[PDB]
Design a protein around this ligand. Structure first.
Ligand SMILES: Nc1ncnc2c1ncn2[C@@H]1O[C@H](COP(=O)(O)OP(=O)(O)NP(=O)(O)O)[C@@H](O)[C@H]1O
Ligand SMILES: O=C1N=CCc2nc(-c3ccc(I)cc3)cn21
Ligand SMILES: [Mg+2]
Length: 301
């Protein structure tokens, strides 16, 4: 293989893992319904359901997300066409993609199976995720958001613990970002939307920053930090943002989440500021055995 991964920084471990995934992907060509065998259900959200499957031609285990959309065949063909751009999203912080196709009123998004599941699933088992672990998660999210913005000019639009995936090798990656404008158009009482997004305002990277801030507060405290549908959104829009409890969390992490949750999107931190925040600088220097922690608290082999 003739890798063109020079644009990425990549340490040796990151390079070896990304090349190993892209090498396995070479076993995968055109994707068809008949070529899959369902193993189990990974989870289900609002948009669809995701299955752990076996791709029979390649022998690869994959995560297959199915989204029910039996609409005008021309508009769904544009969705599928736009989803092919996921073939160009190669990053240590973005879940690997195999292909997207349509069959029997369902669009399938086939991706790399992340054996540690999502952070909302690990949150259930862990109770609360330690600050040191959230440090590495925060790095992964900022770096993934940066890659999507700089390289493909795409905003995530769906940052939350269920869209942050982990594995036994200690990798933290984003999935379910807004790569297809038509999929967004053609498409809970726990909301991660920024106060300006809930009011109407055009999507900005600042809206993903808020979403990340709220997700970190929930993972650190073990509960959604804000019930009745309108009551919940009225609190996000009209009441002060939540804060981390003092004493239990360092001043750097409290300042980091505070900067993400600033109601004013102009005052709110941007990715460049967050990458050089003291919480990130501190977390980057720390030696945190993320894989050891993940495997021991969720019982992964
Ligand atoms: N690649 C994957 N590998 C392993 N588990 C996955 C993968 N993709 C998704 N999952 C799991 O499947 C669950 C359901 O995913 P999903 O249907 O996207 O619901 P959601 O994340 O809760 N909502 P949304 O992202 O807004 O559509 C997730 O919460 C993950 O636990
Ligand atoms: O925008 C969206 N709306 C609804 C569902 C959905 N799934 C994705 C997606 C899935 C895997 C990967 I990797 C990247 C993007 C985007 N998306
Ligand atoms: Mg999801």
């Amino acid at each position: 293989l003739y890798f063109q991964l020079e644009e990425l920084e990549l340490d040796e471990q990151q390079r070896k893992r990304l090349e190993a995934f892209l090498t396995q992907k070479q076993k995968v060509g055109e994707l068809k319904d008949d070529d899959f065998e369902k193993i189990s259900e990974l989870g289900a959200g609002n948009g669809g359901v995701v299955f752990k499957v076996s791709h029979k031609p390649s022998g690869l285990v994959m995560a297959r997300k199915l989204i029910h959309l039996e609409i005008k065949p021309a508009i769904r063909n544009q969705i599928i066409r736009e989803l092919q751009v996921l073939h160009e999203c190669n990053s240590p912080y973005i879940v690997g993609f195999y292909g997207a196709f349509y069959s029997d009123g369902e669009i399938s998004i086939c991706m790399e199976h992340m054996d540690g599941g999502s952070l909302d699933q690990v949150l259930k088992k862990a109770g609360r995720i330690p600050e040191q672990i959230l440090g590495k998660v925060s790095i992964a999210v900022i770096k993934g958001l940066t890659y999507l913005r700089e390289k493909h000019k795409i905003m995530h639009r769906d940052v939350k613990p269920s869209n942050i995936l982990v594995n036994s090798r200690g990798e933290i990656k984003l999935c379910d970002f807004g790569v297809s404008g038509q999929l967004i158009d053609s498409m809970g009482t726990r909301s991660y939307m920024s106060p300006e997004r809930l009011q109407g305002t055009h999507y900005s990277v600042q809206s993903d920053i808020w979403s990340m801030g709220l997700s970190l507060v929930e993972m650190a405290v073990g509960r959604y930090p804000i019930m009745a549908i309108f009551e919940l959104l009225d609190y996000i829009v009209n009441e002060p943002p939540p804060k981390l409890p003092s004493g239990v969390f360092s001043l750097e992490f409290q300042d980091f989440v505070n900067k993400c949750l600033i109601k004013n999107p102009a005052e709110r931190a941007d990715l460049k500021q967050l990458m050089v925040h003291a919480f990130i600088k501190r977390s980057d220097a720390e030696e945190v055995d993320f894989a050891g922690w993940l495997c021991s608290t969720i019982g992964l082999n």
